[PDB]
Each structure stands twice: as C-alpha cells, then as structure tokens.
Enzyme design. Structure first.
Site, mmCIF file in Angstrom:
data_model
loop_
_atom_site.group_PDB
_atom_site.id
_atom_site.type_symbol
_atom_site.label_atom_id
_atom_site.label_comp_id
_atom_site.label_asym_id
_atom_site.label_seq_id
_atom_site.Cartn_x
_atom_site.Cartn_y
_atom_site.Cartn_z
ATOM 1 N N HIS A 1 0.814 -1.194 0.000
ATOM 2 C CA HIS A 1 0.000 0.000 0.000
ATOM 3 C C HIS A 1 0.855 1.253 0.000
ATOM 4 C CE1 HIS A 1 -3.945 1.948 1.661
ATOM 5 N NE2 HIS A 1 -3.615 2.368 0.454
ATOM 6 N N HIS B 1 -17.286 17.754 6.501
ATOM 7 C CA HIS B 1 -16.198 17.676 5.507
ATOM 8 C C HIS B 1 -16.705 17.833 4.038
ATOM 9 C CE1 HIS B 1 -13.159 15.782 2.960
ATOM 10 N NE2 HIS B 1 -13.975 14.743 2.800
ATOM 11 N N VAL B 2 -17.777 17.167 3.676
ATOM 12 C CA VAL B 2 -18.290 17.242 2.350
ATOM 13 C C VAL B 2 -18.939 18.621 2.130
ATOM 14 C CG1 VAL B 2 -19.813 16.184 0.660
ATOM 15 C CG2 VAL B 2 -18.548 14.720 2.160
HETATM 16 O O1 UDP Z 1 -12.082 16.404 7.383
HETATM 17 C C1 UDP Z 1 -12.271 15.283 6.902
HETATM 18 C C2 UDP Z 1 -11.462 14.782 5.840
HETATM 19 C C3 UDP Z 1 -11.767 13.514 5.373
HETATM 20 N N1 UDP Z 1 -12.802 12.786 5.829
HETATM 21 C C4 UDP Z 1 -13.075 11.433 5.327
HETATM 22 O O2 UDP Z 1 -11.869 10.725 5.688
HETATM 23 C C5 UDP Z 1 -11.675 9.588 4.806
HETATM 24 C C6 UDP Z 1 -10.250 9.665 4.326
HETATM 25 O O3 UDP Z 1 -9.870 8.374 3.908
HETATM 26 P P1 UDP Z 1 -8.687 8.217 2.825
HETATM 27 O O4 UDP Z 1 -7.487 9.039 3.298
HETATM 28 O O5 UDP Z 1 -8.651 6.756 2.633
HETATM 29 O O6 UDP Z 1 -9.394 8.815 1.523
HETATM 30 P P2 UDP Z 1 -8.960 8.535 -0.035
HETATM 31 O O7 UDP Z 1 -7.519 8.146 0.022
HETATM 32 O O8 UDP Z 1 -9.905 7.538 -0.467
HETATM 33 O O9 UDP Z 1 -9.326 9.867 -0.647
HETATM 34 C C7 UDP Z 1 -12.712 9.748 3.725
HETATM 35 O O10 UDP Z 1 -13.771 8.891 4.089
HETATM 36 C C8 UDP Z 1 -13.187 11.202 3.830
HETATM 37 O O11 UDP Z 1 -14.517 11.466 3.379
HETATM 38 C C9 UDP Z 1 -13.550 13.301 6.904
HETATM 39 O O12 UDP Z 1 -14.496 12.609 7.316
HETATM 40 N N2 UDP Z 1 -13.276 14.541 7.397
#
Ligand code: UDP
Length: 711
Positions: free
Chosen positions: A202, A583-584
């Site tokens: 990973h 966050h979204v």
């Molecule tokens: O302030 C934040 C930033 C990120 N996320 C969530 O944190 C996870 C981050 O996981 P990862 O780093 O695996 O995301 P990827 O690599 O898939 O973008 C995701 O579910 C985001 O939606 C969150 O809930 N709050």
C-alpha cells in the site's frame, strides 16, 4: 484506520551448545530465510528432540509457527524459551510480535519493554516498539524509536522503511531524494535475496519504485497468506460450472472488513440492494463485527444474504462457508489493508475472484483473477503493473454514495453579505420551504437571501458560535455544531433535518480571495507537489491554500517548506479534520481543489466534486495517481486534467484569475455531478452486472481469465 505496521522477528544463532542441536537450529534458520518453512519446522523439531531444553530452538520454532498463523502454539514455545532462559531478550521481542498480531497491544508493549530492559542495545526490539507507537498515532515517538534502532543497527531495512513512512506522514522531507533512492535500493536488494520487502504494498505507490518492483512487493505480501493456508492442507474446491443450482442467478460475494462506518461503505453501501434479483444473488461477507451504525444496518437489510465471518475466525472454515453458499464471483474489497483476510481468497472457494474498489493497487497474487477498473485509470499499456487481468467498467470504476447520503447538498442558497456562491451557504431538506417564507428572496439556480433582518440574525448566530436558531418555524443550524444536534447527521448515517449554514468566516478563510483546497491526508503531498501549489499561489495574487491537520504535527513542516519557496504563512490555512457530513459540506466554500499527483484523492475526490468544486489533477502511471482523472473524465470535465506540471499550474491559475471561466467550470461540475454517471449508483450497479456476466460467460465456456477491455 490504517494497516498494522509489520514487525521484525529476531533469529537466534545457537552457539556454545552440542554440535548436533546447534547445527540443526542454525540450518533451520537458513531454511526459514530461503522460504523453506516446512523444512525449517522439521529441523527445529529435530533440534528439540536432540536437546528438549534448547531455548533458542523453542523461540526460533515459535517464530516460524507465527509465520504459519499458529499463534497459540508459538506463544507456548516462547514461554518455554523464557522459562529456560529468563533473560532471553530475543524470545520476549518475538513473543511481542506475536501478541501484536493477536491484537494484544498491551501484551506486546509489555514484551518489547521487557526485552529492552534486558538488552538496551537490542535494535530489533526498539524497531518493534516503534511499530506500536506508529500504529497508535504517536509519530514522534515512533521516529525516535526507529532512529534508536538504526543507530544500533545501521543496516536495518524494516526500521529504515517504516521510518521513511513516518516521515512521509508528517511531511518531513529532509534529504528526500536520497531517502527515495535508498528505499529503491533496499527493495532491489530484498527482491534479489528473496527476503520479504520492507516497503508495504500500500505504501509502494508513494516511492519511485518501478512497476515490476511494486508488483513484486505485492506478490511477496500475498505469499504470506499462502504460508498460512498451506498448513491447512485443504484440497481445491470444486466450483459451479453453470447457474442451475442458483436458479439462473449469478451468486456474487462481497468480502469486506468495512461494512460499517468506513470510507468503503460511504462509497458502495447502496450497491448490494441495487443488484437485480432476477439475475443476481448477493452475499455480503463481513470480516468485522457490527459497529452499531446505519451503514451496517443498511447492507444487512438490503443484501440478499449477510454473513458475519468475524464469527468464523478460522480461515479454512470461513472459506468452507463461502464455498457452501455456491459463490460464482468473490470480490476482494480489502487488498493489503487492515482487517483483510486474504487467506480466504488464497483458498480459492470461488471460481472467479476479483479485486474491487477498496484497495488502489494490485494484489500481485495468483489467487486473484481480475481487477475491476477502467480505461482511464488503468490503460492496457500499463497492464504490467497488475498481476490480475483488467476488467473495465465503461466510465470509472470509482463510485460514491453521496447522492443518498448528502441529498441536502444537491441544492444551495447563499446570503448576499454587502454575489458569491461560496462565502455564506445554506443547505437543507426544507430549504425551499424556508426560502418561500421570505418574501424578499431573489433567484440567480441559486437563491439569494438579501441582507435583511433574517440574514443578520443568521450571521449573528455564526459570529457568536451559537448552535441553532429558529426562524419562521425552521431550525437553522451552525455547521460547526452538527454533532451537538444530531450525531448521526454528522457521520452521514442520516440526512440532516435542519437548514445548515456554512461560512468562510467559520474557518478563517478570506471573503475576497480565491480558495484552493486539498482535504487529503498530508502523506499524499511531496516536494514537487507543494512547489506546484506555491507556483500557483504566487501567480494568483491574494489566493490561499486550505489544507487539513491530518495530522496536525505535519503543519509546521508544510509551513516551513512553503516559506522556503516564497510563500508567506498566512497564504496556507489549516482546519481540523471534521465529521463526514461537515467535511463534504464545507468543500462548497472552496473555489478549486488542487489534487495530489503522487496519490490522488479517491474518496476525497468524490467528496469535493459533490460540493460542485472543480478539481485539477495530473494523472501519473499508478492506479492511485490516476483515479481523480478517471472521476473527472466520467463527470465530463476534461479541461481539469493536466498532462504535465506546467499545464496543472496553468489550469489552476486560469481558474483563480478569470472569474467568468471559474463560474462556468463550477457550473459544469455542479450540474454534471447529477447529469453524469459519476454518482449514479443504479447505473453503476447495472454496468457492474454486465461486467460480472462477461466474467462468468468466459469461465463457463471453459476459459481462464482474460483482459475484458473492449471499447
Ligand atoms: O475532514 C475530513 C477529511 C476527510 N474525511 C473522510 O476521511 C476519509 C479519508 O480516507 P482516505 O485518506 O482513505 O481517503 P482517499 O484516500 O480515499 O481519498 C474519507 O472517508 C473522507 O470522506 C472526513 O471525514 N473529514
């Protein structure tokens, strides 16, 4: 939740003893290094027959038994070794590694600290202790312990590589280029000498390793699962050759440790229930217990069958259950992530086994047949990176459940403080009815609340940090306080019931300048990337970069490097990690998202696009560097994909400098997140079904897997 850092077992060379027993133990150590595990075991057991109280041979045997997944029998021998020799530090450290693998962190720490108490100069124990700090989120202590180990044992690949990833997590780029060459050189040496590579699969995506090296690290990691299932001596399973027993339905099994509050569920929780029951029968195999969340509830209710394998922890028996259910296509949602039980796939209980969605890379392993991907993500020219055959979805393999989780973000309204789309924003299910109750609202479509009595009261609630107010019978919420109102709305388990207000002032962002964001974990950033971002900020007069404290200890490293490239401190603004919904929702405040080329936003890329935020990306070669371009291609925004660093900077500069162009591209994203396939889970599921039937037909006609890549 990350994977568990690997540990280093210490092989004890026997000396001073009987020639026969010493020789058997030492030769056993060599056979273990070569990968002749069974033969190693036979030799340690001969050594123990010759000299029953042979502490070294007890501990070394236990170490190979741990490799074979025989954890309780390994512990029994470690304890026998320590009884014979109470200051045998190797046995405590090795026992530590076994306890860690059993999820007994406290026991592991007790063993490692005992080992170190016995022998302060024991490098491997320092390194193993470091791995506990790393997995706890104590990066500075992990770095300290790895440094001690390397000081004691300068040639120490596990310590060096785990240290490098600690440094990557906190954006410490000290001697970065030399560090990258060294990681490559270590991996080259280990692949040549047939030793398990110290770079985890990973993590291999982050370092300038060749594709063949990345694939080979993956393969060697898969081979650990083989050593665990070989001791079961299970015959091949006999697989269905038709669909008659399942009444013409294809039985698809989704295997995941993440059916619960995890990003994977945030992506695909609606898919099981969207499967067409006239042709497909869905089995969901959970590798984790029920965490109480609605994610777990939904998949349990909607799947045709749900099976909790956390209750069947023996892999032989869990695989037997999968086989008994008659599965045609078994889908590996984990890859090399914590909770995976890839042994289940290594046992081959299904005739077709496919990698899908959870793991952004190849398994490297003969037991997986297909990787579900797409032509943008994984063009056929780069098939060398994968052991699996390519199986293409028609747009992107990526999907997100945003339309079902965050429907309150499908529309927005703003307050015209003084017309901007991203300074003060309102969203809610009853937003329309709220706006119809204000006689002075005007329509741009984006409703605008003028500066009036009501707007002042809303802004006052935000300025004062109040939780919520009621206007005209409607609850109006402070977007910072969602968890105090409804904790399930904050996690994405439920749709918020209030009208939520989100503002640039809440996060210290400027009202009169361009906001560039990136909400990924900081490990995805490298020196080239931050230099690109500085070049953009330098060309867009008062623009800012909005990043997360992810983790907070990386912030001063990012600020110092940014200062050395000529950015003042006030040009980068950091916010804390937030609850999912916040966050979204808060991505609506940015003008543009600047994607990380080294490893793109994946979930994070879908998050930003659901807010209507254009993302600029530069796709690389690895699957992990190409996902965001794939999402953007599906969305229908080719102008946001750069072929090189100059073009990424130019695209981002133009978005921040030509405000009509900005508005136009924003409007495309806003509209196409609904009109494109990107967030359409029903369409996605229907196309996955067609792909599954292509797989199945090919097998049923008597063929081995082939690339399924036809335009
Ligand atoms: O302030 C934040 C930033 C990120 N996320 C969530 O944190 C996870 C981050 O996981 P990862 O780093 O695996 O995301 P990827 O690599 O898939 O973008 C995701 O579910 C985001 O939606 C969150 O809930 N709050």
């Amino acid at each position: 939740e990350t994977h568990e850092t690997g540990t280093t077992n210490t092989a004890t060379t026997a000396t001073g003893g009987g020639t026969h027993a010493d020789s058997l133990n030492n030769l056993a150590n060599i056979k273990r290094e070569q990968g002749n595990i069974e033969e190693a075991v036979r030799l340690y057991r001969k050594a123990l027959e010759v000299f029953p109280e042979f502490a070294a041979a007890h501990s070394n045997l236990a170490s190979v038994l741990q490799q074979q997944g025989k954890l309780q029998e390994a512990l029994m021998h470690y304890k026998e070794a320590i009884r014979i020799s109470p200051t045998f530090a190797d046995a405590y450290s090795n026992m530590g590694n076994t306890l860690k693998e059993m999820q007994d962190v406290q026991g592991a720490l007790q063993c490692y600290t005992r080992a170190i108490q016995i022998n302060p100069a024991f490098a491997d124990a320092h390194s193993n202790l470091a791995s506990i700090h790393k997995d706890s989120g104590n990066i500075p202590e992990a770095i300290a312990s790895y440094r001690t180990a390397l000081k004691l044992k300068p040639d120490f690949p596990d310590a060096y590589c785990n240290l490098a990833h600690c440094l990557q997590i906190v954006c410490d780029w000290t001697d970065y280029d030399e560090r990258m060459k060294k990681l490559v050189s270590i991996v080259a040496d280990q692949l040549e000498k047939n030793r398990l590579p110290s770079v985890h699969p990973h993590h291999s995506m982050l370092y300038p390793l060749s594709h063949g090296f990345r694939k080979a690290i993956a393969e060697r990691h898969g081979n650990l699962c083989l050593d665990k299932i070989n001791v079961l001596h299970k015959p091949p399973y006999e697989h269905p050759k038709d669909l008659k027993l399942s009444d013409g339905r294809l039985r698809v099994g989704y295997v995941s440790s993440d059916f619960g509050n995890h990003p994977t569920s945030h992506l695909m929780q609606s898919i099981p229930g969207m499967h067409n029951p006239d042709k497909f029968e869905v089995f969901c195999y959970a590798l984790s217990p029920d965490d109480g969340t609605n994610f777990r509830v939904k998949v349990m209710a909607e799947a045709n069958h749900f099976i909790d394998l956390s209750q069947i922890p023996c892999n032989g028996k869990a695989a037997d259950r999968i086989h008994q259910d008659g599965i045609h296509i078994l889908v590996n949602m984990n890859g090399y992530t914590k909770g995976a039980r890839n042994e289940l796939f290594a046992l081959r209980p299904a005739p077709i086994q496919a990698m899908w969605l959870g793991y952004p890379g190849t398994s490297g392993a003969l037991f997986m047949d297909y990787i579900i991907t797409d032509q943008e993500t994984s063009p056929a020219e780069v098939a060398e990176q994968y052991s699996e055959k390519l199986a293409y979805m028609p747009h992107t393999f990526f999907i997100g459940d945003h339309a079902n989780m965050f429907p309150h973000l499908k529309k927005k309204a703003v307050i015209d403080f003084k017309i901007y789309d991203n300074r003060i924003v309102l969203n809610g299910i009853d937003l329309k009815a709220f706006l119809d109750s204000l006689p002075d609202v005007k329509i741009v479509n984006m409703p605008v609340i003028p500066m009036n009595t009501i707007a002042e009261a809303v802004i006052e609630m935000i300025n004062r940090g109040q939780i919520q107010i009621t206007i005209n019978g409607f609850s109006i919420s402070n977007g910072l306080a969602t968890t105090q109102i409804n904790n399930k709305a904050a996690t994405g388990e439920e749709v918020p019931r209030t009208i939520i207000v989100t503002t640039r002032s809440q996060y210290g962002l400027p009202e009169d300048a361009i906001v560039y964001c990136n909400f990924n974990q900081l490990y995805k950033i490298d020196p080239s990337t931050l230099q690109m971002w500085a070049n953009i900020l330098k060309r867009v007069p008062n623009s800012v970069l909005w990043l997360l404290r992810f983790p907070a200890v990386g912030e001063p490293n990012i600020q110092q490097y940014a200062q050395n490239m000529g950015l003042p401190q006030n040009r980068i603004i950091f916010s804390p990690v937030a609850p999912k919904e916040e966050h979204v929702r808060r991505g609506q405040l940015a003008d543009v998202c600047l994607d990380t080329p080294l490893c793109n936003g994946h979930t994070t890329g879908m998050d930003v696009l659901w807010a209507g935020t254009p993302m600029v990306t530069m796709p690389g070669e690895t699957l992990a560097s190409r996902v965001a371009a794939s999402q953007l291609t599906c969305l229908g925004c080719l102008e946001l994909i750069a072929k090189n660093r100059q073009e990424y900077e130019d695209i981002a500069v133009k978005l921040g400098t030509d405000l009509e162009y900005l508005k136009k591209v924003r409007g495309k994203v806003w509209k196409q997140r609904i009109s494109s396939p990107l967030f359409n889970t029903k369409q996605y599921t229907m196309e996955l079904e067609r792909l599954y039937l292509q797989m199945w037909e090919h097998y049923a006609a008597g063929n081995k897997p082939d690339h399924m890549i036809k335009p």
